[PDB]
Design a protein around this nucleic acid. Sequence first.
DNA 1: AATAAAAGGAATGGGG
DNA 2: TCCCCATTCCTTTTA
Length: 91
Amino acid sequence: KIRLYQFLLDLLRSGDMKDSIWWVDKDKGTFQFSSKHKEALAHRWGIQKGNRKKMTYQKMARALRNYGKTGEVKKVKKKLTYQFSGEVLGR
DNA sequence: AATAAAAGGAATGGGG
DNA sequence: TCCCCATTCCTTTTA
C-alpha cells in the first residue's frame, strides 16, 4: 500500500489536483496545500487507503508530522508548507 | 468571539 | 511478539 509521502509526491508529479497542492520551490522539494481546497485532497487519500472513516486534512497532517523524525517530510515555517527530503525526491 | 493552523500524547487499527 | 505505517480521538497553543 502506498505511503502518504509517496501519494503526495505522485500528485505533485501528475498535476492531478493542482488546485489543492503545488510546489513552492520544486528544486528544494517544498510544497504547499491550498487553504480552501485541501480537504478534497485529504478525502482522496482516505478513499485510496480504504480507511473506515472520512479522512480530514487534520488527520492527514497528523500523519505527516510523524515523518519529521525520520526525515521524509518536514514542516516548513510557512503556512501549510512542507518539504520532502532529498532521498524522497531522488526516488 | 469565530476561524484556522499547528502541535502532540495516547489509544486504536494494518499488515506483516 | 512486536514493529510498520498510519488512523482516530482529544486537548492545547498560536495567530
